Amino acid sequence: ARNTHIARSEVPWPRPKNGKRRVLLNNFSAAGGNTCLVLEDAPEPEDSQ
Amino acid sequence: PGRVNYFHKFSGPSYTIDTACSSSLAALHMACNALWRGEVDTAIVGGTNVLTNPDMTAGLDAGHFLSRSGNCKTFDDEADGYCRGEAVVTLILKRLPDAQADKDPIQASILGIATNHSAEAASITRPHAGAQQDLFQQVLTETGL
Amino acid sequence: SFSDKLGPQVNSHLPGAKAPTPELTSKSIPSAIGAEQQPMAKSPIAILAASGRFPQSSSMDQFWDVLINGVDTHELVPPTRWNAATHVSEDPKAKN
Amino acid sequence: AQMRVVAFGDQTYDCSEAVSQLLRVRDDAIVVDFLERAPAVLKAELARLSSEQQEETPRFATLAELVPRYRAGTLNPAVSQALTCIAQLGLFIRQHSSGQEAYPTAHDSCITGVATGALTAVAVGSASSVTALVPLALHTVAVAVRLGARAWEIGSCLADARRGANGRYASWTSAVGGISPQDLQDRISAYTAEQALASVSVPYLSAAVGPGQSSVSAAPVILDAFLSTLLRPLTTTRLPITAPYHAPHLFTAKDVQHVTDCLPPSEAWPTVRIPIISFSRDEAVSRGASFPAAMSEAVRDCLIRPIALDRMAVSIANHARDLGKDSVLPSPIALSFSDKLGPQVNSHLPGAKAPTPELTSKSIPSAIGAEQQPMAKSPIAILAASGRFPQSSSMDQFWDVLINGVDTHELVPPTRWNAATHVSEDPKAKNVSGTGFGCWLHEAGEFDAAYFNMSPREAPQVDPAQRLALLTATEALEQAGVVPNRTSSTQKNRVGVWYGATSNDWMETNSAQNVDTYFIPGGNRAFIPGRVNYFHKFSGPSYTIDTACSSSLAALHMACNALWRGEVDTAIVGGTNVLTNPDMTAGLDAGHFLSRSGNCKTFDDEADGYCRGEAVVTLILKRLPDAQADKDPIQASILGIATNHSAEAASITRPHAGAQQDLFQQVLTETGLTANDISVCEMHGTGTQAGDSGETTSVVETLAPLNRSGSAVRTTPLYIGAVKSNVGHAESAAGVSSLAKILLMLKHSKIPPHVGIKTKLNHRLPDLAARNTHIARSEVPWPRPKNGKRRVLLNNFSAAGGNTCLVLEDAPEPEDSQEVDPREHHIVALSAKTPDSMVNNLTNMITWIDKHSGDSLATLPQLSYTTTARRVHHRHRAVATGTDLLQIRSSLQEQLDRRVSGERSIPHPPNGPSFVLAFTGQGSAFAGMGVDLYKRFASFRSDIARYDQICEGMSLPSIKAMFEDEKVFSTASPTLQQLTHVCFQMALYRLWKSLGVQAKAVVGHALGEYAALYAAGVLSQSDTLYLVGRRAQLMEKHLSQGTHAMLAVRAKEEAIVAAIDGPPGEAYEFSCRNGEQRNVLGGTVAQIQAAKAALEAKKIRCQYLDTPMAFHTGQVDPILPELLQVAAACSIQDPQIPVISPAYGKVIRSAKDFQPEYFTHHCRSSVNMVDALQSAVEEGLLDKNVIGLEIGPGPVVTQFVKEAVGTTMQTFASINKDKDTWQLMTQALAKFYLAGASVEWSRYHEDFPGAQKVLELPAYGWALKNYWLQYVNDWSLRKGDP
Amino acid sequence: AQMRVVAFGDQTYDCSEAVSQLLRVRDDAIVVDFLERAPAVLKAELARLSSEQQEETPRFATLAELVPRYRAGTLNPAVSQALTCIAQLGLFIRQHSSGQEAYPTAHDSCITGVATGALTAVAVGSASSVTALVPLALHTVAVAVRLGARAWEIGSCLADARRGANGRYASWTSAVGGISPQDLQDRISAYTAEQALASVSVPYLSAAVGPGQSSVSAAPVILDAFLSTLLRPLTTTRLPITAPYHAPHLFTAKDVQHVTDCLPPSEAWPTVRIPIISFSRDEAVS
């Protein structure tokens, strides 16, 4: 209903044109702490031609 | 990290973080904090875990943390705890302008990182959904996404 | 609020006149090298490399080989860590 | 009529001081941003130099590292030009941004610049604001770097540094005075003609300073060979120019073009607006040129044209004359001989002057909250500190051991591990050590499990480190007066915990002898801060730092980083070390780390290792402005902190003195202090010969250097000490232990003696006496300089190779409010989680009072404030009231005697008390009613003012005069009287509601119905005012004076009915039925007289009522329609609480009963108080356990409530005709507190600043118990045997 | 030949987007400094409010946490006033610092603002550069907090929040269309005469926005009852104003003096140098 899936099989994850992919990373604690992290994609490489 | 500093002759800070099962990400947060105020220009973040003491496994089992059936059955209806794993991994970090100036390879970019404590949970070990939701929303707002 | 009507209303009380805006007025000079970057505080942090040793994997490529193939790596404790036959019981009754 | 002139100078001006000053600016955003962005541009431009040049440039992170190199003279021309430009631009920006100076304009100002300052002239002449100037400044910086690099390249190609370079760069020019430029040129021409020289290497004059002064440039060797021929009376001085400049025979247009190639081409380049005076060029004044073109011309000036400095003043004066002005006011920046400028500029001008008063330099006051500097790079305040050291259960006992110079080391106690089996003279057996000495805490197993919700089963298997961390953290939080959610900075989401631990011996040795369900929670180091966060409900980051033997200062560094980034507002930092694993001692002795003789003997000639000690310490940190705004107690400020690694050591464990010296210098430079400001240096001093010698030499070289003459440069003694010779090496709490010692010395203002040196001072140390450095052998006074502060340097090193440094400071001088607490009576509150803790707290408080009985007269209010406002209040409570400390002491002593005699404390009910609020009629009003409340409480004053203004809005008489004059009650009109009564009742109710008194039901009596209805949410304040005012006005208007009267009889209803002839109602009617034995009769004055005559004939004591009007009688008939019309206007609502209404004699609970006719009925019908009270008691609303408060001039209605309810219903009043209001208020608050009410103590003291200070009260009286898991059977010596 | 006029709005305009955008600026030092200092001044001034007002104020570490509450209509008048003024000043400062726009000058510019935008108007008219304007901006933020607090105090005095409020702050005003202001005034007078009402709770004309439109303010229940009397083709639309304003029969010179009592007396206070167009006043330009 919310448009979220658990990939039961390999699915492509292509980079959007003129865009980036973003990720959320969670790592919690038995002591109680929580750490969250928002990841991105590296800029398109401007390698000398 | 002391041996890494000594062998490679790096004369910058050197800490080991023992936060928790989240030690590696806490160390990453600390490294980013150091990077964000110019203390260091390059960082070597990592995390290690090698199991060689039966008593830690015995204690974790006695605490009902581990699963007596196999691996971690995430999202399953019969999930009954996790199983211990071994892994060592190291990463190299830089501020994006510095990474682009030196022409280093870049695999991803960290936009923001935050930490908090589930201090309102029923017991110390159990998690608190409200705290995690607040953390996620705070990070999202800070990142501007 | 309703700002777009301020112009027509004010100019309706004045002698006829209409002047456009040069779209190129926003042209800016180029910043000095090394200054265009945003301050160090809250700046993106790059990940340059990564290495590790995971179960059934002596590199990251082998880690991906494990991940994409959907194989779980759990197994009983080897004999080089401790002897399972005596350190593990169906119901723990002995010390430790 | 006056023109300002901005002038910049050349490289001749020593700019090191200016650069040092700018780097210390913290209150200007523009300057800070510019100084962060200039190093980046500088580095980017340096990276594209030649290969040989790049080898000679230093590597730096900030501009600070280039200052000492600039002073030493070992900085190449490129960086020198860049630094000159940066200093000039930063000075100008700071002057015109935080100096609040109008930017120069084209009509009142001109810009001039000597060769290197010609670039900055273009940079600031092409803008109109500092914001528009910042980018041009960076472009100019890059251009200057390139210019210096080009000159350096040409010079280096011309000549090579001599063999004896020493690193210094020779000077390429020298100022020669004594002849005019023409004679000097003739001499140079003759010299180069007689002597054959390459046309490209001849000497040339690069300036014309004046009629008899000039400058000459050439390659250092050639210049020296030429200046030798200039004999007396000509004098020559070597200027600090390290490259050739102003040489039209060494540079061409190509070089000028190359330098200015860093500027890309475009059309958005700003032009030159403010005229620039180029005294060296043909056209003195230039304007209207693009930015790149003017920059190219400036570079040409600085490379190809000689400085015509004998024409600057003439050109400026000519410009001033042309503009028509008559005087010039100079504002030179980094200009040499700047003082002489203005005189010679004005010499060419007609005489004129215009002084500026210095009193006009004043500035607008900053808005509250904007005066503080940005949280980044802000002092961190230490508010409190608690710890457990050997032979010390607190910091006072730690001071005792320090000052007494006692040695603590001893053999292993039987509780840890047997020494007869784990120690041998020469280790030969497996897992056997040669040393068994240490400094132990003998009460590490003592804990209050109940206080922290732990269980007797779980407590033993919790690492003593965690238990002591909890104890010390709670103690430190209590000592700092921090209660969660009390303030913005103490919100639970803004508090984090950092702890430094490096061992979990409990898991290895004690907990592992039997693994139970609490093995991991109780043993893992993750739970040392986790338990603190969980128990105190702080929801901020929590970390454990295992850095090294220097973990505590690493944790402090991380906490300060978190505070400086704004991710927390309060931080709890600490460090733990409890030794219980014999294997750790065996492995430290196998590595030759521990001494086999005794304690750490630092600076001694026979140092042969250190001793293992134990210590737990916890501190509370906070940014300085947040602590000051919170009225928290501050005892030190952290100015800076840094870390690095000794990775160049010969061995991993061995220290490296060079790294330590770099760390100390870095911290000192960042903090902005000089070597002479540090009076004390607390060093690691771990009692090892080589390590002690290296640390001492590095510290002395940093803080106590030697001048070239070989004499001391310090003007004040520097004292060196180490806490480790007294308590050993805590080795994970060592940093916090040293910091705690420093705090104690700051408190007591004396330096304790040093006990490490037992035989003889180590002979490898530097001669300290020659350096003005001392090792205190007897305690010396350490007084705080008046109008000054004393600072410290703290060190902490590691076996892993990490070094940490920290600079401390004295707290700001207290600004204590000198206002005297007008309150007469005061309230002191104690609380505990256990009856035993209650007895302990009472005993400790009584002891404290005796020791502090006569300290001052302001101590009682501050004790009240600390005990009530700044504390957490638990289930078991005890309170004391009095006017002086002696009364409180006596009351507390009586309570303690009764408690010890055999009584037992009982926790208050979980939900607290329940209140019923009674509002009185218009009978108890007296002159001066609530006049002290109007004077002392600001909320009451505001409420009364608002009510008065609203009344004036509705055409009603003012009410303020009845609360200020106090002499108008006598002649108050009846409407004014009723208005004052209702307004006072409403304001008073709002006051009590502000102190945490919540109403569960409200009951009025014949005039409190309006206030009660407001308090129940039925009406608003405006509606109540309108109703009461219009009712009174109608009563006064339609009716007359003396029409009826009222009387009261102290007899039953049947008796009064029988004693009077005639049925009730037709002649007389009941007006109020206060109680069973109390009734009030009303009727015509003649009828009242007849009734009194009839009843008094029966010998019944009745009394006339002073009320002039008559309510609930026949006199209120001809105004009912008007009251009905008025009441239909006001809004109505469902009450939030039951409204006991005597008018209807029931418990009304809905808005359907408060229709407009209800008000008319009340204004006419009788006050059937008794029936309403009985209805409420039947409904169960009122019980004997319900508290009753009296919102009114006296305890009238509450008495009736007590009769209706029972006889054991404690009740209190708020105002009285004879008793002081503060006595009653204090008594009521004390009884509510004892009941269980959560009083808003913060609001009770907010209006009395004189009482707002936190005292150092005795710590909590914990009910300690021993929880230990003994290590048995010596199994650690058989790790691997069958 | 041409002059530019900078106009500031009021509470009616939504400022969530503006405040969110301002918090994402990273290339401007002045804007970052202002957005760091403004929360400090707001927290310092919000600590001087009465007890009942502080229980209804949210706890925020930074301005980012107030946007979600502002959008949900759960922000009391004081913080809303502060946020509106902060957004206005921040937008102006960013435009004139990063936008590289010349500061307004009296020769070819004039400031103007409506009720809430007049504070920002005077703040911007007394300065000559963004650097010189930042402190006056913080003073204006404090004054806005105080003004909102006073209006909220009086409004709460008049009437209390309804039972089913659920947190939201009921609007106190509403725009009216289809009448000239005069006939609407006579309608208000007739409705007041027919139902006797306290002189303080009577509806009043807060604004006259056009020849056939205007605004009417009153207590939420009084306003709701009155608007039911207006029948088609009479149109009514609510506005997001949560306190009584523009009420000469509720506010006096004492309230004005109290609101502006956070500015210490001194003879440095810069004098407005660029004319401010005051259309409501008797003197058009001051």
mmCIF file of N, CA and C in Angstrom, chain D residues 360-427:
data_model
loop_
_atom_site.group_PDB
_atom_site.id
_atom_site.type_symbol
_atom_site.label_atom_id
_atom_site.label_comp_id
_atom_site.label_asym_id
_atom_site.label_seq_id
_atom_site.Cartn_x
_atom_site.Cartn_y
_atom_site.Cartn_z
ATOM 1 N N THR D 360 31.953 59.832 21.100
ATOM 2 C CA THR D 360 31.059 59.512 19.994
ATOM 3 C C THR D 360 31.323 58.133 19.401
ATOM 4 N N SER D 361 32.322 57.407 19.904
ATOM 5 C CA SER D 361 32.669 56.081 19.401
ATOM 6 C C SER D 361 31.788 54.981 19.979
ATOM 7 N N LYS D 362 30.734 55.349 20.696
ATOM 8 C CA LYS D 362 29.899 54.401 21.410
ATOM 9 C C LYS D 362 28.951 53.663 20.460
ATOM 10 N N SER D 363 28.478 52.505 20.919
ATOM 11 C CA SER D 363 27.783 51.544 20.077
ATOM 12 C C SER D 363 26.425 51.199 20.670
ATOM 13 N N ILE D 364 25.487 50.849 19.794
ATOM 14 C CA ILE D 364 24.133 50.492 20.219
ATOM 15 C C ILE D 364 24.218 49.218 21.052
ATOM 16 N N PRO D 365 23.335 49.016 22.030
ATOM 17 C CA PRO D 365 23.415 47.804 22.857
ATOM 18 C C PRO D 365 22.909 46.587 22.096
ATOM 19 N N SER D 366 23.642 45.483 22.206
ATOM 20 C CA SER D 366 23.251 44.260 21.522
ATOM 21 C C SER D 366 22.034 43.635 22.192
ATOM 22 N N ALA D 367 21.151 43.066 21.378
ATOM 23 C CA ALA D 367 19.981 42.383 21.906
ATOM 24 C C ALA D 367 20.401 41.166 22.718
ATOM 25 N N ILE D 368 19.637 40.887 23.775
ATOM 26 C CA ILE D 368 19.972 39.777 24.657
ATOM 27 C C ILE D 368 20.001 38.489 23.854
ATOM 28 N N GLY D 369 21.064 37.709 24.033
ATOM 29 C CA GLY D 369 21.264 36.481 23.299
ATOM 30 C C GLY D 369 22.148 36.615 22.079
ATOM 31 N N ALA D 370 22.412 37.839 21.622
ATOM 32 C CA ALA D 370 23.258 38.071 20.462
ATOM 33 C C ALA D 370 24.657 38.546 20.824
ATOM 34 N N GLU D 371 24.928 38.810 22.103
ATOM 35 C CA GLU D 371 26.257 39.255 22.502
ATOM 36 C C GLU D 371 27.265 38.113 22.516
ATOM 37 N N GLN D 372 26.817 36.891 22.785
ATOM 38 C CA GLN D 372 27.727 35.759 22.866
ATOM 39 C C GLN D 372 28.293 35.417 21.493
ATOM 40 N N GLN D 373 29.540 34.952 21.487
ATOM 41 C CA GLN D 373 30.187 34.549 20.249
ATOM 42 C C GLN D 373 29.624 33.213 19.770
ATOM 43 N N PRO D 374 29.808 32.888 18.491
ATOM 44 C CA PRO D 374 29.247 31.638 17.966
ATOM 45 C C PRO D 374 29.764 30.430 18.728
ATOM 46 N N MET D 375 28.897 29.423 18.857
ATOM 47 C CA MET D 375 29.224 28.265 19.682
ATOM 48 C C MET D 375 30.499 27.578 19.217
ATOM 49 N N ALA D 376 30.842 27.698 17.938
ATOM 50 C CA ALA D 376 32.125 27.193 17.470
ATOM 51 C C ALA D 376 33.246 28.044 18.050
ATOM 52 N N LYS D 377 34.261 27.387 18.607
ATOM 53 C CA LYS D 377 35.354 28.075 19.288
ATOM 54 C C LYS D 377 34.812 28.960 20.411
ATOM 55 N N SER D 378 34.159 28.314 21.372
ATOM 56 C CA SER D 378 33.607 28.992 22.530
ATOM 57 C C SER D 378 34.090 28.304 23.799
ATOM 58 N N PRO D 379 34.353 29.052 24.869
ATOM 59 C CA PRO D 379 34.823 28.411 26.102
ATOM 60 C C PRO D 379 33.815 27.395 26.613
ATOM 61 N N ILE D 380 34.331 26.293 27.146
ATOM 62 C CA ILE D 380 33.518 25.228 27.718
ATOM 63 C C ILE D 380 33.681 25.295 29.228
ATOM 64 N N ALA D 381 32.565 25.396 29.941
ATOM 65 C CA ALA D 381 32.573 25.595 31.382
ATOM 66 C C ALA D 381 32.391 24.263 32.092
ATOM 67 N N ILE D 382 33.228 24.012 33.095
ATOM 68 C CA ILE D 382 33.090 22.844 33.956
ATOM 69 C C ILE D 382 32.240 23.263 35.148
ATOM 70 N N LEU D 383 31.044 22.691 35.263
ATOM 71 C CA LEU D 383 30.119 23.098 36.310
ATOM 72 C C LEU D 383 30.309 22.327 37.605
ATOM 73 N N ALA D 384 30.685 21.056 37.531
ATOM 74 C CA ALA D 384 30.827 20.242 38.728
ATOM 75 C C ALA D 384 31.783 19.100 38.430
ATOM 76 N N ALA D 385 32.134 18.365 39.480
ATOM 77 C CA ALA D 385 33.022 17.219 39.345
ATOM 78 C C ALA D 385 32.903 16.362 40.592
ATOM 79 N N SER D 386 32.753 15.056 40.398
ATOM 80 C CA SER D 386 32.711 14.095 41.487
ATOM 81 C C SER D 386 33.607 12.920 41.133
ATOM 82 N N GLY D 387 34.122 12.246 42.153
ATOM 83 C CA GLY D 387 35.007 11.127 41.893
ATOM 84 C C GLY D 387 35.219 10.277 43.124
ATOM 85 N N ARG D 388 35.895 9.150 42.903
ATOM 86 C CA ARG D 388 36.276 8.216 43.958
ATOM 87 C C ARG D 388 37.740 7.861 43.755
ATOM 88 N N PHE D 389 38.585 8.258 44.697
ATOM 89 C CA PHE D 389 40.019 8.013 44.618
ATOM 90 C C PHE D 389 40.427 7.126 45.786
ATOM 91 N N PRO D 390 41.612 6.522 45.764
ATOM 92 C CA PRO D 390 42.026 5.712 46.913
ATOM 93 C C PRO D 390 42.148 6.564 48.167
ATOM 94 N N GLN D 391 41.617 6.040 49.269
ATOM 95 C CA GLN D 391 41.574 6.745 50.547
ATOM 96 C C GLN D 391 40.735 8.014 50.474
ATOM 97 N N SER D 392 39.882 8.134 49.460
ATOM 98 C CA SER D 392 39.063 9.323 49.267
ATOM 99 C C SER D 392 37.702 8.901 48.739
ATOM 100 N N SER D 393 36.645 9.281 49.449
ATOM 101 C CA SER D 393 35.279 9.047 49.008
ATOM 102 C C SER D 393 34.661 10.285 48.373
ATOM 103 N N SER D 394 35.450 11.325 48.146
ATOM 104 C CA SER D 394 34.969 12.570 47.561
ATOM 105 C C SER D 394 36.190 13.379 47.151
ATOM 106 N N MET D 395 35.950 14.606 46.692
ATOM 107 C CA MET D 395 37.055 15.451 46.258
ATOM 108 C C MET D 395 37.717 16.174 47.424
ATOM 109 N N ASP D 396 36.987 16.410 48.515
ATOM 110 C CA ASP D 396 37.611 17.017 49.688
ATOM 111 C C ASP D 396 38.646 16.083 50.304
ATOM 112 N N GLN D 397 38.339 14.789 50.383
ATOM 113 C CA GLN D 397 39.325 13.843 50.893
ATOM 114 C C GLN D 397 40.494 13.687 49.929
ATOM 115 N N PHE D 398 40.231 13.787 48.625
ATOM 116 C CA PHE D 398 41.318 13.820 47.656
ATOM 117 C C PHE D 398 42.230 15.010 47.909
ATOM 118 N N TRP D 399 41.648 16.174 48.195
ATOM 119 C CA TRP D 399 42.461 17.328 48.554
ATOM 120 C C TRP D 399 43.251 17.059 49.823
ATOM 121 N N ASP D 400 42.637 16.382 50.790
ATOM 122 C CA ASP D 400 43.356 16.038 52.012
ATOM 123 C C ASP D 400 44.610 15.237 51.690
ATOM 124 N N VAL D 401 44.469 14.185 50.883
ATOM 125 C CA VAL D 401 45.630 13.348 50.586
ATOM 126 C C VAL D 401 46.658 14.134 49.780
ATOM 127 N N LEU D 402 46.205 14.980 48.852
ATOM 128 C CA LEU D 402 47.148 15.753 48.048
ATOM 129 C C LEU D 402 47.956 16.710 48.914
ATOM 130 N N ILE D 403 47.274 17.519 49.724
ATOM 131 C CA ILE D 403 47.957 18.558 50.486
ATOM 132 C C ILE D 403 48.816 17.947 51.585
ATOM 133 N N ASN D 404 48.343 16.872 52.218
ATOM 134 C CA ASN D 404 49.137 16.232 53.257
ATOM 135 C C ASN D 404 50.350 15.498 52.701
ATOM 136 N N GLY D 405 50.450 15.345 51.383
ATOM 137 C CA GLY D 405 51.601 14.699 50.782
ATOM 138 C C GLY D 405 51.751 13.250 51.192
ATOM 139 N N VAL D 406 50.662 12.493 51.130
ATOM 140 C CA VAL D 406 50.643 11.108 51.584
ATOM 141 C C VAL D 406 50.863 10.186 50.394
ATOM 142 N N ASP D 407 51.510 9.054 50.657
ATOM 143 C CA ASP D 407 51.737 8.014 49.663
ATOM 144 C C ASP D 407 50.701 6.917 49.853
ATOM 145 N N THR D 408 50.108 6.467 48.749
ATOM 146 C CA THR D 408 48.945 5.596 48.797
ATOM 147 C C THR D 408 49.235 4.149 48.427
ATOM 148 N N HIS D 409 50.342 3.872 47.745
ATOM 149 C CA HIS D 409 50.579 2.535 47.221
ATOM 150 C C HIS D 409 50.625 1.508 48.344
ATOM 151 N N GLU D 410 50.183 0.295 48.027
ATOM 152 C CA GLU D 410 50.236 -0.815 48.967
ATOM 153 C C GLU D 410 50.073 -2.111 48.187
ATOM 154 N N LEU D 411 50.285 -3.225 48.880
ATOM 155 C CA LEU D 411 50.186 -4.534 48.255
ATOM 156 C C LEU D 411 48.734 -4.860 47.917
ATOM 157 N N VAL D 412 48.558 -5.867 47.069
ATOM 158 C CA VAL D 412 47.208 -6.233 46.621
ATOM 159 C C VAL D 412 46.380 -6.673 47.822
ATOM 160 N N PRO D 413 45.174 -6.149 48.019
ATOM 161 C CA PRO D 413 44.346 -6.612 49.125
ATOM 162 C C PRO D 413 43.789 -7.992 48.832
ATOM 163 N N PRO D 414 43.352 -8.726 49.856
ATOM 164 C CA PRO D 414 42.838 -10.082 49.610
ATOM 165 C C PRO D 414 41.625 -10.115 48.700
ATOM 166 N N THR D 415 40.906 -9.002 48.547
ATOM 167 C CA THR D 415 39.686 -9.027 47.747
ATOM 168 C C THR D 415 39.983 -9.199 46.263
ATOM 169 N N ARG D 416 41.100 -8.653 45.780
ATOM 170 C CA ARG D 416 41.405 -8.742 44.355
ATOM 171 C C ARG D 416 42.020 -10.093 44.004
ATOM 172 N N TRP D 417 43.201 -10.387 44.543
ATOM 173 C CA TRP D 417 43.834 -11.672 44.285
ATOM 174 C C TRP D 417 45.016 -11.846 45.224
ATOM 175 N N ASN D 418 45.233 -13.085 45.659
ATOM 176 C CA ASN D 418 46.279 -13.373 46.630
ATOM 177 C C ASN D 418 47.647 -13.005 46.076
ATOM 178 N N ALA D 419 48.456 -12.348 46.907
ATOM 179 C CA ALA D 419 49.791 -11.944 46.482
ATOM 180 C C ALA D 419 50.813 -13.055 46.668
ATOM 181 N N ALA D 420 50.594 -13.949 47.635
ATOM 182 C CA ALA D 420 51.545 -15.024 47.881
ATOM 183 C C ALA D 420 51.653 -15.985 46.706
ATOM 184 N N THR D 421 50.627 -16.061 45.860
ATOM 185 C CA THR D 421 50.624 -16.962 44.717
ATOM 186 C C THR D 421 50.772 -16.252 43.384
ATOM 187 N N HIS D 422 50.324 -15.005 43.278
ATOM 188 C CA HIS D 422 50.384 -14.262 42.028
ATOM 189 C C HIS D 422 51.628 -13.398 41.902
ATOM 190 N N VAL D 423 52.506 -13.394 42.900
ATOM 191 C CA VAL D 423 53.698 -12.557 42.894
ATOM 192 C C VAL D 423 54.890 -13.393 43.331
ATOM 193 N N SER D 424 56.013 -13.214 42.641
ATOM 194 C CA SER D 424 57.252 -13.895 42.976
ATOM 195 C C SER D 424 58.407 -12.918 42.826
ATOM 196 N N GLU D 425 59.504 -13.210 43.525
ATOM 197 C CA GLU D 425 60.659 -12.319 43.477
ATOM 198 C C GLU D 425 61.206 -12.207 42.061
ATOM 199 N N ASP D 426 61.325 -13.332 41.365
ATOM 200 C CA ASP D 426 61.714 -13.355 39.957
ATOM 201 C C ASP D 426 60.762 -14.278 39.206
ATOM 202 N N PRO D 427 59.874 -13.749 38.364
ATOM 203 C CA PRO D 427 58.863 -14.608 37.727
ATOM 204 C C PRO D 427 59.499 -15.754 36.958
#
